[PDB]
Amino acid sequence: MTDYTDHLATGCTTLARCYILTRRDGVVMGFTDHDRDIDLDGTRCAAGAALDASTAARSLGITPDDMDAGGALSADAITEADLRAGRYDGAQVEVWEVNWTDPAVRGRLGVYTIGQVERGPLAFRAELRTRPALWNRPEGRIHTALCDVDRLGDHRCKLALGPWQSAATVIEADGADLIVSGLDETASNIFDRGVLDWTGGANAGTGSDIRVARPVAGGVRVSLWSAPPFPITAGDTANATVGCDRTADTCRNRFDNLANFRGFPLM
Amino acid sequence: MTDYTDHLATGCTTLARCYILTRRDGVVMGFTDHDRDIDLDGTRCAAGAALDASTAARSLGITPDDMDAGGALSADAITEADLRAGRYDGAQVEVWEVNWTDPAVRGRLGVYTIGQVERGPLAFRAELRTRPALWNRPEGRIHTALCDVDRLGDHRCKLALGPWQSAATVIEADGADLIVSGLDETASNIFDRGVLDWTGGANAGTGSDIRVARPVAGGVRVSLWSAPPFPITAGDTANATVGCDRTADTCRNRFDNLANFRGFPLM
Amino acid sequence: MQFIDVEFPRDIAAGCQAVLTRRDEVVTLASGREEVNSRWADTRRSWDAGLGVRDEADLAQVVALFEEVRGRLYAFRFRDWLDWRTAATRAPITATDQPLGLGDGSRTAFQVVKVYGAVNPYTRPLSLPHPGTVRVALDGVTQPSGWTLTAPGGVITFDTPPALGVTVTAGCSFDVPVRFSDPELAVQWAYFREGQAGLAQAPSIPLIEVRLDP
Amino acid sequence: MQFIDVEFPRDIAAGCQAVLTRRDEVVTLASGREEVNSRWADTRRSWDAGLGVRDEADLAQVVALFEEVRGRLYAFRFRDWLDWRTAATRAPITATDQPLGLGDGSRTAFQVVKVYGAVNPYTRPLSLPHPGTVRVALDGVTQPSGWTLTAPGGVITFDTPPALGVTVTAGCSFDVPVRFSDPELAVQWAYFREGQAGLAQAPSIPLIEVRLDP
Amino acid sequence: MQFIDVEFPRDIAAGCQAVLTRRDEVVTLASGREEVNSRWADTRRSWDAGLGVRDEADLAQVVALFEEVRGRLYAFRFRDWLDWRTAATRAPITATDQPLGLGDGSRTAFQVVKVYGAVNPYTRPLSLPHPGTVRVALDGVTQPSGWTLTAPGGVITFDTPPALGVTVTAGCSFDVPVRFSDPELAVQWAYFREGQAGLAQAPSIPLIEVRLDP
Amino acid sequence: MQFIDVEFPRDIAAGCQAVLTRRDEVVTLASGREEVNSRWADTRRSWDAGLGVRDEADLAQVVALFEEVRGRLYAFRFRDWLDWRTAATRAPITATDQPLGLGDGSRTAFQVVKVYGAVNPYTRPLSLPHPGTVRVALDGVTQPSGWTLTAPGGVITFDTPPALGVTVTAGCSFDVPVRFSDPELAVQWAYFREGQAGLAQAPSIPLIEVRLDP
Amino acid sequence: MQFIDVEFPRDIAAGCQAVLTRRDEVVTLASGREEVNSRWADTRRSWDAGLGVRDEADLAQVVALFEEVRGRLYAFRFRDWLDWRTAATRAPITATDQPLGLGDGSRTAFQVVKVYGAVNPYTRPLSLPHPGTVRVALDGVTQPSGWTLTAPGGVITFDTPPALGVTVTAGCSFDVPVRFSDPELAVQWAYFREGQAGLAQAPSIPLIEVRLDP
Amino acid sequence: MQFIDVEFPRDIAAGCQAVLTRRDEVVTLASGREEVNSRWADTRRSWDAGLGVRDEADLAQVVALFEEVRGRLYAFRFRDWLDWRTAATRAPITATDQPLGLGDGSRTAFQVVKVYGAVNPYTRPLSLPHPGTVRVALDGVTQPSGWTLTAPGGVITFDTPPALGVTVTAGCSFDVPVRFSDPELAVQWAYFREGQAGLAQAPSIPLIEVRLDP
User: Please, which domain of life does this record's source organism belong to (chains C, D, E, F, G, H) (predicted)?
Assistant: First the structure.
């Protein structure tokens, strides 16, 4: 950006800032402000329908900066269904100021993450919150009676996992209560309060929580807490994940990881 | 203003209200609204780019009215350097309504003190807060372990003072750390936490607090807590003031005013 | 709905403005990027009337007519000179001039449709075919009886559906539906009596061709 | 109410201009379906006058009338030539020309109403019927008397109610209540003295025919 | 108050415009609902002056005169041609022309009052009767001495109050009080000297007839 | 994009008005140092058309074209006389007149470009070359064939790339994509029927030459 | 202050128009009682100038004067013909024409003042009295000398103060300080070269007679 | 900076308008209080061009020229008729006409400076002396070789600095730097070809004389 400063000083400057965007899925859109698409470092940035709003919010993070960048929705670059899916949610966009006059000088104006997303019939508004804002969300590190093991296999949990987890294919598409096949009766009720990551389909390992796993005819009907993101077709592969109630007793019955038990029950 | 009310009733009224301003220094500026200069009560108020008053806020002290009488800055009447110095800050301006038709009838519309002051390249903006607002500042009367004697020699303190205090002339201008001469080695470190009122120069007895009073070659280098208001030339007369930490031990060692310590340290 | 059919006098129509109203644009970024929004069912027309009144008595008649609908109740019948001719102002409209469509052996009903443009024509169904200008034609021969024309509908229904391969061609005058844009009407009448005046051009009567939702 | 009865001279009315305002609209979506919502008080006429005041002395007389009203106390009468004749302006106005209605054997009172249009006529009740132009005709014969016109009311009351199936036809000149829109009065007087003048027309004075709200 | 009486030249007044300012409207809901607010004591007259200056020297005189009052100090005396004649521009004003009132045997003082309108007249007291046009009349005979006219007051006081049954009639020219509407004055003079011009009209000198509060 | 190929008639184009808009500016401080910041898409041409439509039947044809575009589906072709000739308007356009560039032995494709200037010509790529006016000349000799013009592309591709140091000179008429600014279309027809006419020029229709975003 | 002494040429001063602005008003309630509140600085004269330049070379001289002032450093002198004569433009200006005041035996200094009015003249002090037109007359006789005029001051100081009851009459031309309202200067120069011109008058230049704050 | 020197044709300049832009006023309170703000280095000149194009081919040339700078890249050379002549439009410019300054024995470089005004002149350094009109003079004799003129600089450097007491006088035509005020250009060209028109003037091409920051 030093040469970019020089370009401004000379006055021979053409703005080609490219708002490269990496979504939660990891797909990348160059989105350059310049009307002629520029490949900077091998990355074409789309001239078409690139959100402008270049100044937006520009503090140094003392104030978390949400760069409001309402942009014309480009179906090709951005999909409404994906926005609804949330693939676009939590998308980190690195705004690099580049010059058409010189591709070599790229200085990142800011690192931003879309935090607030809004939609319109043909256009959309995005608030590009800075990393401090996400960092500033409070976790609280609560310590309490129930196992805080939570998701199994985490570094704190040190869960062996392994054999209990099983993979199944959906036999019937019932939205939240889809019936699946390839799951044993024993497997059911161990996947209760678990997840059903869908290898098959758009989810690609994204799983709605299984509120209830109940054995039925033709495999286990799985009642998810919520309807699956994307319409899940029957026959889509899913990896059922063992669900622990994370009660000290439940943790003990299922795995008995005394060394790693995060449930401090008595007082 | 009884006759002024009569002037309004007749309709034969010309407004000559003069915004007499007394600054912290005590210098007085006429600042009259009337374009023709009026010598009311001897004092001459010239229009002098009088601060403009437009939207009337009048509450009888239930609400202190801080009039934003920001007018074109008059260089002759007011100096920016003095404003930076703060001599103009805390200026008490008594707004006296006068009539050009009759000099004799002068009634003070209100008594005001400039509190919030801002400047422009050729203009100024100032808030003339009423006296209740300053009165309403909360002291709290805190009572605690350290001597609450604070500045020595107050009526409550009943400090003997006297011999320890000394007078010195600056030998080197170092801003906050100016080196001074005429101070004894014993005097150094007794003026630690003291004040260095400058008889010489614009300060005229205004002294920055001495953060450190460490003896050096050619007299004591005085490290003030802050750079002196106004540029202090070398050789300016100064009066060094003894500084008491107010620790019970310090209070005892320096003066031992048990009768008036205002300290409650040992429990 | 059923609507109302109330004729707008042709003489008053003679003094009337014509402006084409079209929608569906809403483009995107001004980087040379264009997106075609689709409002749907557009191509209305805008008109200002009253320039054809001629005299006070006639002016009274239109005013009374506006009062009749009490503010555009339902539909209003407007004679559109431009759409009246399926052919040309100097050329007689014929059944053959406008092509309704082709019967498939099940196509009993054909709405009168005005095709405007060629490669990508927009077709406008006509709510009211002007009576007596409606002629039905078939590829083999001009078609006479057995076609049931719904005058409010604009649909002509063959009792026996035309078989595949016969082109249905119908050309008729267009009595377009209109809804007045503004309730307020300016009156320029010129006081009569001793003055004996009267005015030929009442101003500010605004109407919009309305594609009624059926 | 009784109001204040002050006539507006027709000579002063000469040269004046008017506009017609309707209050019913409130349309719906752009689908092409529009709903008409009416709050009433539609079709009010707004008049701009002050014309034909001749010399300044005549203008002074109108000014005196404005002073008499004192900001339009109550209502002010205005005579409209257009409504004065039930028939066409050249044509004679007759009892036969306007048909009030049909008696049921109990219908003593008939409002004088101007019906505008034919299919759904908007009726203008006449608050003030100009006296002496009132002619009442029973179906059997013209009625010389027994119809009690209430001049403020605009209602004619037959002492003996017309029998069932009896048409009542009444034609009369129209006097309409008008309230001035603006308190200020615009005056063009033309200076007299040596360069003698007197402006024939004063600038438009806004007076609005008002359908009084009960 | 005492005010100031400063004459406005008639020739400058010849150029001056006349408009009528009236208040007391503020009607209620526009559903045809009307409510009469009363501002009280209205009917001021609007004027724009300076168009009668004729030449540079005269223009200077009015400008100096405006400076004399230093912005309309108190009252200013304006000659109004319209109010000057109690009768007509072509007809001489007489004591009988305007009726002051009737003495009750205790009514020593009568303000000159101009009655405008008839059925509900608004009467305007005149602050300054033009001197020498003031004539007092009594029903028995025109009244000469013994009436004390307060020229600033506009009140004529009979030393012996007229007994009941004698009509006091007084007609006089009206020297109306005026206060300039705008402090700003446009000066159009046309350069003289070698050019030797001078200007008949100076624009933008608005004045408002002022009903002085006493 | 392929777009929609609809020609704008030269006759309709006749009589039109145009404007030129540049997007590079963004200057700095008042020190006298100004910085030029360019975002691209500069020098677009804005056209106001509908002129020279003659009789209304011809205007109807243009209206039909507007209907065919249906709110400018894709882009619409427009013929510019100014750019049609590479040379001066009276002067003949030749392959020699516009020099496309120099081949390097691998340069099969040459864009047709209009170079606007000498020191730093702004180049306007021609998206659509009018067919048959295209003349291609190799440095050695005029090329009859082997240059493959992509009509939508505006690129001529030599089957055998021109050798290093070989000048390519090509001159052709310019057809430029235009997208209409406003969905509504203004219509001037002047009426026909008894008062036969057909307004010679319809009111300005905003159509903008748009450099399409890639 | 001393200011900058730059004379506005009388020839450039030829043709300008002026407006007079008074700052005293601030009226009260609508009761008819109005209070005049004066903040002073009333009756300033605003001038639109640049008239009578004749040619671009002459205009250049005025432009040079504008450049000399450099955004009106201090104040700029303007010559007003209207005030130049104490009496009338045709009439001779004499010491007798303007009476400065009466000496008390100690009144050495007399300000040159223009008294605008008779009853309450608004006095305009003359900051700059044009030299050589100054004539001073003591009550006994015209004074050849001993009156010390301060040209910047506008004050004439008698070395020996005039005795009690002695009238001092002084008449002189009036030079008035003016500060330009707008920094930008509009230029009408009329191109010369082949089409030789030179505009007769430059566009109005806003310059305001300013009563400087003391 | 280095900038760009691109000539603006004189014929187009003949059509171009002239206005004077001056800053540094921002005065204090309007109580008659005045403070002179100093913007610094002002006196730019405003112009509107394109009116001298005469014909379509020339219009194309300026348009291409505007495209060459792609929106006022750096500086643009503008011929100013007013500044071209140090002396007069009818009088030849000479080295003696404009005084550069006096050599002190160390003063090798003198910028061409235009002194405008006399008592407090503002001097404008000229960025580009028009070539061939640059003549150097010394008090003893007109100076020939040994003066190094930096055409972009506007500075003339004597190899041997002139000793004290010799006046350097240089008068040259002024090729002033210009930056266009607005990127948008209005094209008035008048269709040629069958129409065979072309336009003398193109409106809306504003330019501002730019004092380039070095």
Answer: Viruses
Phi, psi of H203 (to 5 degrees): -85, 175
Give all chains having 3 or more CB-to-CB distances under 8 Å with chain G. B, E, H
* Sheet of B106-119, strand order: B28-29, B18-22, B92-98, B106-119, B124-130, B67-68
**φ, ψ dihedrals at C175, nearest 5°:** -95, 90
List the one residue out of E210, E211, E184, E207 whose CA is nearest residue E47. Answer: E207
Query: What helix, strand, coil percent values describe chain B, rounded to 5?
Result: 15, 30, 55
For chains G and F, having 3+ Cβ pairs within 8 Å is answered no
CB within 8 Å: A72 and C32: no
Q: How many beta-carbon contacts under 8 Å exist across F and H?
A: 93
Amino acid sitting at position C184: E
Q: Quick count: other Cβ atoms within 10 Å of Cβ F162?
A: 24
- For the CA atoms of H55, H59, H61, H67, the dihedral, rounded to the nearest 10 degrees, stands at -170
* Position A78, amino acid: I
Beta bridge partners of C207: C47, C180
With CB atoms and an 8 Å threshold, state whether E73 touches B10.
Answer: no
E83 closest CA partner among E44, E119, E121 = E44
- d(CA B53, nearest CA chain G) in Å: 13
Enumerate the H helices of D54-126 as residue ranges: 56-69, 81-84
Burial pattern A186-215, b for ≥16 Cβ within 10 A else e, equals ebbebbbbbbbbbebbbbeebbbebbbbbe
Name subunits touching H (3+ CB pairs < 8 A). Answer: A, B, F, G
Residue whose token pair is 């040469």: A3
Residue with token string 């009568």: E110
Partner residues linked to D48 by β-bridges = D17, D206
The answer to whether residues A85 and A230 touch, using CB atoms and an 8 Å cutoff, is yes
Interface test with C, best of D8, D29, D34 (most C CBs within 10 A): D34
Residues shown for chain E? 214
- Local structure of F83: helix, strand or coil: helix
Q: Are D24 and D39 in contact (CB under 8 A)?
A: yes
Determination approach: cryo-EM
Q: Which two three-digit tokens encode residue B225?
A: 């807590």
What whole-number distance in Å separates Cα of residue A199 and Cα of residue A232? 11
Q: What secondary structure does DSSP assign to chain C, as a single string?
A: ------PPPHHHHHS---EEE--------TTT--------S--EEEEEE-TT--SHHHHHHHHHHHHHHTTT-S-EEEE-HHHH-SS-SSS---TTTSEEEEE-SS--EEE-EEEESSSS-EEEE-S-BPTT--EEE-SSSEE-TTEEEETTTTEEEESSPPPTTEEEEEE--BEEEEEES-S-EEE-----TTS----S----EEEEE-----
Q: What is the C-alpha separation between H59 and H15, in angstroms, rounded? A: 12
The CA-atom distances, in angstroms, between B159 and each of B152, B155, B166, B241 are 6, 8, 16, 13
State whether G89 and E56 contact (CB < 8 Å): yes
Given in angstroms, what resolution was this structure solved at? Answer: 4.5
Chain Cα centroid distance, residue D149? 16
- Between CA F109 and CA F129 the distance in angstroms is 14
Q: How far apart are CA C149 and CA C114, in angstroms?
A: 16
- Cβ-Cβ contacts under 8 Å between A and C: the total is 29
Distance CA B193, CA B181 (A): 18
Of D64, D185, D213, the CB nearest to E31: D213
Report CB contact under 8 Å: H68, F118: yes
- B112: number of Cβ within 10 Å: 26
DSSP D169: E
Alpha-carbon span H34 to H32, nearest angstrom:
6
Q: Please report, in angstroms and rounded to a whole number, the separation of the first and last CA atoms in chain H.
A: 6
Rounded to an integer, what distance in angstroms lies between the CA atom of residue F16 and that of residue B99? 69
